[PDB]
Amino acid sequence: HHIEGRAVAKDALGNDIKVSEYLAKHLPGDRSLAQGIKGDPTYVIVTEDHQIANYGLNAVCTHLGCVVPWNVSENKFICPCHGSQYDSTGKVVRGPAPLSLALVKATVTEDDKLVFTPWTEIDFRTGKEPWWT
Ligand code: FES
C-alpha cells in the first residue's frame, strides 16, 4: 500500500512513464491506460489544468473483467462486453457491473515519474469504503 502494494506507472512496452513527456502527449481530459499495480490496466487522467489527476482508475470492469474503454463523446466509460457504463470519475452508472471502477492513488514524483498506490480513503463517489481494499 505504501511501498509494498505500490507501482511505477509503465507504458505499453513496460518502460516507466516520464510524466513531463507524458503530459506533452496527452491533453486535458485525456484518459489513457498505463500498467499499474501488479500490472493492471489503469487509467491515467489528465485534468483541465493539464496535470495528472490525484487518482487513476483500474479499468478492469467490475462485472466480468473486460478492460473498459473511455468514450470521449458519451463522456463515459462503456464496456463493450455487456454494456456496463461508468461516469467521468469511474462511478458505475449502469449495470450489470455492480461496483464502480476502483480508484487508485496517483502521485507525481520528484524524479519525474508517476506512482500508483492503493486508494484507502473514502470513495469520494459513493461515500462507501473501498470495495477493493
Ligand atoms: S465485462 Fe464489462 S459489462 Fe461485462
- Can you give the CATH number for the domain in which 130 is found? 2.102.10.10
Residues in contact with ligand 1 by the CB-under-6-Å rule are: 61, 63-66, 79, 81-84, 96-97
Between CA 122 and CA 23 the distance in angstroms is: 28
Nearest residue (CA) to ligand 1, atom 3 = 82
Q: The domain containing residue 90 runs over which residues? A: 1-133
- Alpha-carbon dihedral sign for residues 127, 87, 55, 119: positive
- d(C-alpha 79, C-alpha 97), whole Å: 9
- Please give the number of the atom of ligand 1 that sits closest to the Cα of 61: 2
β-sheet with 41-45: strand ranges across: 7-8, 114-118, 103-108, 55-58, 41-45, 31-35
Say if CB 86 and CB 77 are below 8 A apart.
yes
Cell of 15: 518502460
CA-CA distance, 100 to 17, in Å (whole number)? 26
The resolution of the experimental structure, rounded to one decimal in Å, is 2.0
- Burial degree of 14 (CB within 10 A; 0-12, 13-18, 19+): exposed
**b/e code 95-125 from CB counts within 10 Å (16+ = b):** eebebbbbbbbbebeeeebbebbbbeeebeb
Q: How far is it, in rounded angstroms, from Cα 102 to Cα 82?
A: 18
Please give the tally of structural domains in the chain.
1
Choose one of 67, 78, 81 to mutate for the ligand 1 pocket test, by most ligand atoms within 8 angstroms of C-beta.
Answer: 81
Any binding-site annotation on 26? no
Secondary structure string (H, E, C) spanning 7-49: EECECCCCCECCHHHHHCCCCCCCEEEEECHHHCEEEEEECCC
Determine the distance separating the centroid of ligand 1 and the alpha carbon of 63, expressed in angstroms: 5
Q: Report the C-alpha gap between 18 and 113 in whole angstroms.
A: 5
Alpha carbon of 67 to ligand 1 centroid (Å): 8
- The DSSP element (H or E) to which 77 belongs, if any, is strand 76-78
Experimental method reported for this structure = X-ray
